C-alpha cells in the first residue's frame, strides 16, 4: 500500500498515453497527431464512455499532442471537465534540465496520485492524459515496483491503464496498455 | 528481464485467463464455464484470431475452466497444436496449509522455468505463444520475468479471459506490452468472477 494515504473513499485512475503524432515537428504547433493518431483518440474515447462512468476530471499537459488527444476523447464525454498542467509537460545543461524533467514526474505523482481529496465523499474515477513516460513511471511508484524497471512497460499511442486507489492506499493494476479496443492495424507505439 | 538467457529471435508470450466459470461446482469437473464465460471465451478467441500471428502453441492448464476456454479459443485458431499441462494449474490464494503452497510455488516455478524462461535451440523466427490458465500463475510469471516483487502478485488484478502479453527478446530483456486486456470485450460482458 502506498505510504502516507488516506482517503475517504476508492480512487479509479485512468491514465491514456497521446495517440500517434508527427514527431517531427520542428515547433510543438507542428507535432499534432497523425489521422492514424486521431483515429486512435476518438477510439479510445468511445471505449471511455461506454463504460458507464461518470468521469470526474480530465486532466492533460498543454502539449499539442495532450490537447489535440484531449479534444477528441472529451467530445465522448460530455460535461467532463479538463484541467492543463505543466506537471505533465514532457522536456523539450542538458543533464540539469533531465534531473528537472525527472523531478517533474515525481511531482506529477505527487500532486495528482499520491494526493487525495477532503471533498472526495465517494469513489471517484479519474482521467489522466500523458506521455509514455509518466504512465509508467506512475504505475511503477504506485504498485511499489522498482523504479529502474519502468522501461519495461511498453505502451501503446491511445493505451489505457487503469489502477484503483483504496483509501488506505492499496492500489491494484486491472489493466496496463490496454489497445483491445482498436483493430490490430491501428495500433501503433510511435 | 531474464538472467543466463540467451534465444536466438523475440518470443512473444500471451497469458490468458480462463473465461468466468461455475465456482460453486462441486467436483473439478462440475466447475465448468458459465454462459457469460463461454461468451468471454468466444471474444477473446476472436481477438486473438484478428491480430495476424501464426502462433507456434497453445500451452494449457488441465483444469476443467482452462480445457473450456481452450476450446472455445482453438476453434478460432485451426491448426495451432494444444498441449495440455498440470504445471499451470491454478495455484492457493496468496489472500490452506503450507505445503500445499511449497507444492504450488514449486510447481509454479517450474512453469516459469519450463514455458517461459527456456528458450529452444531450434527457434527459427521469431514466436508467438498462448498460455490459457489462471491468475496465480499469470502474476507468478509476469512479476517474474519483469523482475517484480512478491508482494506483486496481488496488486495485478485479471479479467476473466484477460489477455497479458510480454515481449522476451532475444538478450533476455522483457517487455510488458499489455496486462489484463479485455478491451475487446463490451463492459458488459466484463468479469473478475
Not at 499534432?32 to 486532466?59: C, D, H
Not at 488527444?69 to 545543461?93: F, M, N, Q, Y
Not at 479519474?126 to 509514455?132: K, L, P, R
Amino acid at each position: 500500500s502506498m505510504d502516507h494515504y488516506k482517503a475517504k473513499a476508492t480512487r479509479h485512475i485512468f491514465l491514456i498515453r497521446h495517440s500517434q503524432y508527427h514527431v517531427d515537428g520542428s515547433l510543438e504547433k507542428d507535432r499534432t497527431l497523425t489521422p492514424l493518431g486521431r483515429e486512435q483518440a476518438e477510439l479510445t474515447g468511445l471505449r471511455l464512455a461506454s463504460l458507464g462512468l461518470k468521469f470526474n476530471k480530465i486532466v492533460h499537459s498543454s502539449m499539442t499532442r495532450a490537447i489535440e488527444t484531449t479534444d477528441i476523447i472529451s467530445r465522448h464525454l460530455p460535461g467532463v471537465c479538463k484541467v492543463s498542467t505543466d506537471l505533465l509537460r514532457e522536456g523539450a545543461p542538458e543533464a540539469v534540465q533531465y534531473y528537472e524533467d525527472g523531478a517533474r514526474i515525481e511531482a506529477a505523482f505527487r500532486n495528482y496520485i499520491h494526493r487525495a481529496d477532503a471533498r472526495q465523499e465517494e469513489d471517484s474515477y479519474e482521467i489522466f492524459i500523458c506521455h509514455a513516460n509518466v504512465i509508467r513511471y506512475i504505475v511503477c511508484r504506485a504498485l511499489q515496483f522498482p523504479p529502474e524497471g519502468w522501461l519495461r512497460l511498453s505502451l501503446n499511442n491511445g493505451s489505457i491503464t487503469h489502477l484503483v486507489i483504496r483509501p488506505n492506499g492499496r492500489v491494484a493494476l486491472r489493466t496496463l496498455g490496454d489497445t483491445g479496443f482498436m483493430p490490430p492495424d491501428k495500433i501503433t507505439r510511435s
